[PDB]
Write a protein that binds this DNA or RNA. Structure first.
Lengths: 261, 61, 177
RNA sequence: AAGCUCGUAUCAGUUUUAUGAGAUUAGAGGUUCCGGGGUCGAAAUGACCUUGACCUAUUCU
RNA sequence: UUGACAUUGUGAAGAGACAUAGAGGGUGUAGAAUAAGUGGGAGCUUCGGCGCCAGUGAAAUACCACUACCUUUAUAGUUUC
RNA sequence: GAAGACAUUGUCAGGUGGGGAGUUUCACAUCUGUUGCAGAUGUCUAAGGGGGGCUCAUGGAGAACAGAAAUCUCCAGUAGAACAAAGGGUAAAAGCCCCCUUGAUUUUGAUUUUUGUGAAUACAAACCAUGAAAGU
């Protein structure tokens, strides 16, 4: 209350560390407690975020989840007290999802791991390049709760990554969501999750498919029209030469006419 | 001052008869025992018919 | 103002009091002001600048660029002067840490993250195409402005307040507020 | 009700004349790589086993 | 019912704070070691102990500046209890 | 005897006080809660001008891989197409493509919708775009 009893906090963080070592489940009482104290603002310190990092890097599922939900809660200020976020994300993606393919986590937990990885990556300009092929298995409309997965796909995109590994993603989505015969919600979800990719990685889809997607402006369904207008207004301010003359809306065209001579 | 509905609503977080007792939902239930009644003017003629006595022939398609 | 001139004059005289440590003392400006909280993302970034960093740059390039910049007095590299380096993290980190900055051709800023990916992006010296003062987490911010030119100090100060005590310093000299 | 500009001819509960205005795949099989059971597997993205959902050919407009 | 003022005078001893002047500090792991952090860089040298070049580490140590926190030393006075 | 600068007493200021008084009775849709909700994010809230060229939807016949749908050629086709889902209007266009521009510009008054504006409407002077031009 008055002043932070460092002699006490530093002592009762050591027991959390020495609980998380015991690999059965006993770090539950460290994670559940450190989350409470962070929420009450009593343990705002660099020493504590390491505990939840180690929990996220643990083998027990209910401890890993406590760590992941701590670092989630859009993320919290604890990211700004990490020691190496890039190596953290690399170790997570290597241990849990891809490395051994132990298949311990269910889909509801895999999605929460994906959310954390993508939201760290987009925020801190990280580079892993395995993410973008791991998503492709799950990017199918016949898959369980894909609107969460594709909303994290965009969150791992940058201005500073090779756009080919995102081109393959966009061409998977385009092949499987805005193809022939697909439904209105499916096509609208595809276009909406592509334009919010291109808002971070603009040169990740080329003009030839950009035009194929702005085809769907006057689509009579009111989902695909609202979606295509967003892509058009996105590339009207960024790369309006990829768009055709029909779409450059009275100022992009005037800016191009003066700057083309 | 602490015993005021204003202060109660402030410290906690509309219908006639909401107190420390008897929230919204409860007042409506307890009004059922009374106001299945028939409204009239001063000379005497129906303004608002009683509940479940509207007396209008609908379009039954 | 010319209250900068009296400061810089006997800084240049301190130039000739403890003369030489057999190098050249660069000039620096340290910014101190209050009223902002960087733990919230109040971020700033601006690169509208022009020095003498004992220029040590490493350009990656092609045949068209390596024999362009063999002149110039510059360290240069092939693409497979980089391809045959990924096997050793501390090796690819030592070159990371060697040079003050990095540049590369317009072709190789698609391939450089596959090779020098984790490094060279958090370090804040990622290359830039050819043919900074980031408010990351702290209130403290120092920038190297020049060498042993009073104009440059004000030139940078107006830009910093443009973006938003002031101190000027040399390698071992004192502080002048 | 009290009046005041003046006493034209304009008016009219009327007429005349012209003229406009959804559910069905049983029958075949492929997948779920998040649902995995089965003899087996130090070890295995298997022989096959079913729950399935999936892509299908049907019917009305 | 609890607080302030007044009635309300004569004495004493203690604790806390304003306000200045100071003084020092940092173990998750690895690393010689207990790394706030940031920025300049490869000696002022009593020693050339050393700083650079050498690991290990997100971050590298001399030398000199910046501006964050933490803990303590003294009472011109200031007051409160 | 006790007690003592406290209690008390006086004035202010918070709290309690039905004991008592007076009185009333614009949008599809991933992201947090109540139940299948009101709320929070982000996401739509929209290219007009004047010149030229050309006809659309659909069907039939026909061509290696090529099939009901990939590209090509011919015939029919008053609109069955498109123009922000059974409706009016539009076919050398009011539609698609192409060329040039950005009159979606200022000043002076007039009319309808409407006393308040805005909206649309025509009207003249200038700067302008367009086409060879009429003219817009």
């Amino acid at each position: 209350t008055n002043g932070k009893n460092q002699k006490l906090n530093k002592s009762t963080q050591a027991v959390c560390f020495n609980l998380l070592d015991q690999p059965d489940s006993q770090g539950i009482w460290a994670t559940k407690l450190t989350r409470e104290l962070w929420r009450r603002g009593i343990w705002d310190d660099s020493r504590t975020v390491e505990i939840m990092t180690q929990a996220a890097l643990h083998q027990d599922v209910k401890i890993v989840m406590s760590g992941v939900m701590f670092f989630l809660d859009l993320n919290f200020s604890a990211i700004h007290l990490l020691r190496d976020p890039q190596g953290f994300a690399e170790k997570l993606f290597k241990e849990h999802l891809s490395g051994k393919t132990k298949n311990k986590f269910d889909m509801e937990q895999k999605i929460s791991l994906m959310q954390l990885l993508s939201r760290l990556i987009g925020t801190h300009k990280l580079i892993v390049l395995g993410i973008y092929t791991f998503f492709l298995k799950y990017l199918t409309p016949k898959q369980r709760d894909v609107t969460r997965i594709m909303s994290a796909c965009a969150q791992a995109c940058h201005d500073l990554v090779p756009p080919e590994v995102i081109n393959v993603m966009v061409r998977k989505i385009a092949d499987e969501f805005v193809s022939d015969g697909v439904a209105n919600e499916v096509a609208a979800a595809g276009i909406n999750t592509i334009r919010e990719i291109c808002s971070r990685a603009p040169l990740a889809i080329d003009e030839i498919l950009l035009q194929d997607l702005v085809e769907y402006k006057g689509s009579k369904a009111k989902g695909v029209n609202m979606a295509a207008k967003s892509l058009i207004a996105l590339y009207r301010d960024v790369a309006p030469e990829m768009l055709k003359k029909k779409d450059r809306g009275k100022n992009a065209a005037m800016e191009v006419q003066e700057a083309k001579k | 001052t602490g015993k005021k509905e204003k202060s109660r609503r402030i410290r906690e977080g509309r219908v006639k008869g909401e107190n420390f007792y008897r929230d919204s939902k409860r007042v409506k239930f307890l009004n059922m025992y009374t106001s299945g009644k028939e409204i009239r003017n001063k000379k005497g003629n129906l303004i608002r018919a009683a509940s479940f006595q509207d007396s209008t022939i609908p379009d039954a398609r | 103002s010319s209250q900068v001139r009296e400061h810089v004059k006997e800084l240049l005289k301190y130039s000739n009091e403890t003369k030489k440590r057999n190098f050249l003392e660069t000039v620096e400006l340290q910014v101190g002001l209050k009223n902002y909280d960087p733990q919230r993302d109040k971020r700033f970034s601006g690169s509208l600048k022009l020095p003498r960093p004992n220029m040590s740059i490493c350009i990656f390039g092609d045949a068209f660029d390596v024999d362009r910049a063999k002149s110039c007095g510059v360290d240069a590299m092939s693409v497979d002067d980089l391809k045959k380096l990924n096997k050793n993290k501390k090796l690819i980190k030592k070159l990371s840490k060697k040079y003050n900055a990095f540049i590369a051709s317009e072709v190789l800023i698609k391939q450089v993250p596959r090779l020098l990916g984790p490094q060279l992006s958090k370090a804040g010296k990622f290359p830039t195409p050819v043919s900074k003062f980031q408010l990351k987490k702290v209130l403290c911010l120092a920038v190297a402005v020049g060498n042993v030119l009073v104009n440059q100090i004000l030139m940078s100060v107006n830009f910093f307040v443009s973006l938003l005590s002031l101190v000027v310093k040399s390698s071992m000299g004192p502080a002048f507020r």
